[PDB]
Predict the structure of Heme-based aerotactic transducer hemAT.
Amino acid sequence: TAYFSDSNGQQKNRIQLTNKHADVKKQLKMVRLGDAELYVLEQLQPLIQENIVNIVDAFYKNLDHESSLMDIINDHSSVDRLKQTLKRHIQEMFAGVIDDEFIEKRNRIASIHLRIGLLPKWYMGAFQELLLSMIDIYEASITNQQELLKAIKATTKILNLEQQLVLE
Amino acid sequence: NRIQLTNKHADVKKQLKMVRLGDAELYVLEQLQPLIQENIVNIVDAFYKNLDHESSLMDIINDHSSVDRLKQTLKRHIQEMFAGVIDDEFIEKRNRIASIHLRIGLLPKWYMGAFQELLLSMIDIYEASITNQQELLKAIKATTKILNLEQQLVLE
Ligand code: HEM
Ligand code: HEM
């Protein structure tokens, strides 16, 4: 059979932003992230949620490479409390809806990371773990070759936007 | 083997680990270079084609340069990315980029969203040139690491 569900219309109106975030609209289009794409992300969410624990375990384990990062973690919270908010943020990424409320949250996390002194270069590198981790979740849960790229493309898109918004 | 960084860039060596870019991934990039070149013009002519979703970008270019000059560079830079061996010069090359990108006035957000158009281009070429799913992914991941590394370099 097939994995995703080809449904025209069950995709429309997934992007809902107002003047306050005029640019973001151009950004969503510059990465080919539209109604079709977001609806793809929504069909992946269940799949991501079911493996989020691993996703987040691999995540902090990967930062355990750069001592400083782990120090910044401890100085402000903890691995256990951070994993918790991370399982959440990552969830929302596949919500399939992009609106003002979705941007502004990014702005907040962007501000929080700056204050605590997280260097931007260590931020991008964090995503390379997420994407790789998700690539494998897909390749394993999605057998049809073509749909695997479909899913991989959608995520790289949403992840690019994450980086765009965090360091805007 | 394919990494000849001196202690001048000890942090970059940590970044390589963290993005999982080692001899293996680089060897994969080297092998992908031939493909990147017979398609480098379409890749780059596309890159510039997508910059219209935002007039400003196009305007930054026609002032501090020209489309043909930029392509000349891009084509050159993108190819190098698949050399398969990052050393000290490679790293400084990126510093040059950063420096300029700031002077001209390119916001980190547009710069970032630019790579997407590029990533998709490479992904397209592969899906049409690589039949074995494995080799498909193997090529994809490598390209996502070297790409991410750039973003890190031009944004430290
Ligand atoms: C690229 C993946 C990342 C994502 C998507 C992410 C996401 C988040 C989110 C959503 C919050 C909470 C915002 C809120 O409560 O309003 C947060 C907090 C935090 N993040 Fe990250 N983060 C990432 C990477 C990092 C890295 C690499 C570090 C490690 C240095 C880090 C350290 C922290 C810390 C310490 C806090 C909590 C600060 C406090 O309690 O005052 N984050 N992150
Ligand atoms: C995929 C991301 C991009 C890459 C890989 C990239 C790469 C480069 C490189 C290698 C150079 C030459 C640096 C040197 O002189 O040593 C450069 C120059 C430049 N880039 Fe970027 N760039 C990117 C995106 C952008 C975007 C989106 C714009 C804005 C429309 C832009 C505008 C320019 C301009 C105006 C120059 C100056 C060239 C000159 O001085 O004549 N770049 N870029």
